[PDB]
Paper text:
Despite sharing the same sequence, the two VVTL1 isoforms, I and H2 exhibited differences in their chromatographic behavior, a feature that allowed their separation and that also indicated that they possess some differences in physical properties. The physical differences between these two isoforms of the protein were also observed during crystallography. The initial solution for this structure was deposited in the Protein Data Bank as 4H8T. This initial structure included data to 2.0∶Å and an overall R value of 0.224. Domain I is the largest and forms the central core of the molecule. This domain comprises 11 β-strands forming a β-sandwich of two β-sheets. The two β-sheets are stabilized by four disulfide bonds (residues 33–224, 89–95, 140–213, and 146–196). Domain II consists of a long α-helix (α5) and four α-helical segments (α1 to α4), and is stabilized by four disulfide bonds (residues 146–196, 154–164, 168–177, 178–183). Importantly, disulfide bond 89–95 connects domain I to III, while disulfide bond 146–196 connects domain I to II. The comparison of the two structures performed with the algorithm for protein structure alignment and comparison named TM-align tool indicated that the two proteins have a root mean square deviation (RMSD) of 0.78 Å, with a TM-score of 0.98, indicating that the proteins belong to the same fold (thaumatin), confirming results previously obtained with CATH.
Residue numbers in the entry: 25 to 222
Write the structure that this text describes.
Amino acid sequence: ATFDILNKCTYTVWAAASPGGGRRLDSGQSWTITVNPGTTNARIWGRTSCTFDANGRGKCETGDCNGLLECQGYGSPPNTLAEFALNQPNNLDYIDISLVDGFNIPMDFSGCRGIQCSVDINGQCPSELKAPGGCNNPCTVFKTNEYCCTDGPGSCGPTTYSKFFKDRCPDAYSYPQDDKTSLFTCPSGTNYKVTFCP
């Protein structure tokens, strides 16, 4: 599938993708990439307040991926995530927005359907979760089963912290096993758009 990633934010967002790399997107700028069929574990995100040298090495305030402009792996929370797995059994793509790795930039992720998390989550973030330039999931900050779901299927459920996210962005994953209301499919052959600050 092709993904068009567009920055509508008034500030620069350094877009990233696993797999795909990364690009500086000033306001209004787009980057289009191809992710091949069968790819799983994939994600697109944006990074805020980056500094990079002439070789693309540096650091971002949110979503940094091992200090590279061109990501070769996942970023550091908090980062709003567009997650996808392509061309899975029965020709289904599995898509979602996740806040399980935190929020940093409001996002729209569209394909056969539009999913959005566009609220001022940073401005309303609980003091327990606040991070420079974003809002961490409780699981990232507090390493307990109640937030992280490590103890098996059904061992965790919504918490006052997951609900902070879920009340505001009902369609995104708010805790690791938030599947029934956050996991979507599109028929395979769909193409996608990720928009920052929709």
